Design an enzyme around this catalytic site. Sequence first.
Site, PDB file in Angstrom:
ATOM      1  N   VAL A 129       0.827  -1.239   0.281  1.00 11.67           N
ATOM      2  CA  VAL A 129      -0.062  -0.012  -0.065  1.00 11.67           C
ATOM      3  C   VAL A 129       0.709   1.319   0.145  1.00 11.67           C
ATOM      4  O   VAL A 129       1.773   1.267   0.830  1.00 11.67           O
ATOM      5  CB  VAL A 129      -0.765   0.140   1.326  1.00 11.67           C
ATOM      6  CG1 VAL A 129      -1.558   1.371   1.510  1.00 11.67           C
ATOM      7  CG2 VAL A 129      -1.861  -1.230   1.431  1.00 11.67           C
ATOM      8  N   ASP A 174     -11.562 -11.059   9.789  1.00 11.15           N
ATOM      9  CA  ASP A 174     -10.278 -10.834  10.218  1.00 11.15           C
ATOM     10  C   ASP A 174     -10.035  -9.671  11.066  1.00 11.15           C
ATOM     11  O   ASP A 174      -8.943  -8.678  11.003  1.00 11.15           O
ATOM     12  CB  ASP A 174      -9.181 -10.542   9.015  1.00 11.15           C
ATOM     13  CG  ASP A 174      -7.747 -10.908   9.712  1.00 11.15           C
ATOM     14  OD1 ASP A 174      -6.822 -10.467   8.805  1.00 11.15           O
ATOM     15  OD2 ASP A 174      -7.443 -11.496  10.533  1.00 11.15           O
TER      16      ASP A 174
END
Length: 273
Positions: A20, A135
């Site tokens: 990212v 998650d």
Amino acid sequence: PLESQYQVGPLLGSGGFGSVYSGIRVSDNLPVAIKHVEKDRISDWGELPNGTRVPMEVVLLKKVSSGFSGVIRLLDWFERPDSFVLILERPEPVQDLFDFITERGALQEELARSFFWQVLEAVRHCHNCGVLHRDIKDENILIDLNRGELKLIDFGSGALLKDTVYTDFDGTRVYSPPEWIRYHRYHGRSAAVWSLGILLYDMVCGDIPFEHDEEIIGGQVFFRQRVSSECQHLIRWCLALRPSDRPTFEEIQNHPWMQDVLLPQETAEIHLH
């Protein structure tokens, strides 16, 4: 084109979620995050309403990205020969909750209450939009340090929400529930509540309660820090060994420990500014 629409900056991080980079949208200087995921690293595929083949992460993000919410929204995405590129919101200034806890240690209960409440609202939003994250953990929560708002990230382990049993799982093991560890079976909402118990303990104790499988299935919660009895009760309830003994989201939000939550702005004024 991608490179004309966004000005790419430095790498913000990389891991299971891909890589990212910080970015800004040329057209209006909106800060964004530019996430790259290799196609060979993607195992869950889905299709858009118009029937394009995209990562399941994209399918789930589109489903939750409409209107305002406590989720980092997907603004656009591109396919490349060997990867997908996702353009995501980026709050500024921002810090993930794992880094925040690592820095500051265990959180005061007032701050944990506000953070946990926002995470609950965000997870309700996902479930209402038909999305199970699978998650939930401190590393997947971003804090907007000026606004006091928490935002969920990383749906790459998620699934469409369903009422039948899940028999697959690739989220974070120490946040996964004892029924998964033992039977390789779980249902979405009650497994989510388990991970929220782990998260709440982490917030108020500064670390997660279980490490090994045998700890997870023993489900004995020892408190290493001073934690109020109401908070202890809610945590132990979310961490019930039997899925049916766990609270509903409604029951969590109605619990005495969750009353009188601060708004995001006051949270930042008091605790973050």
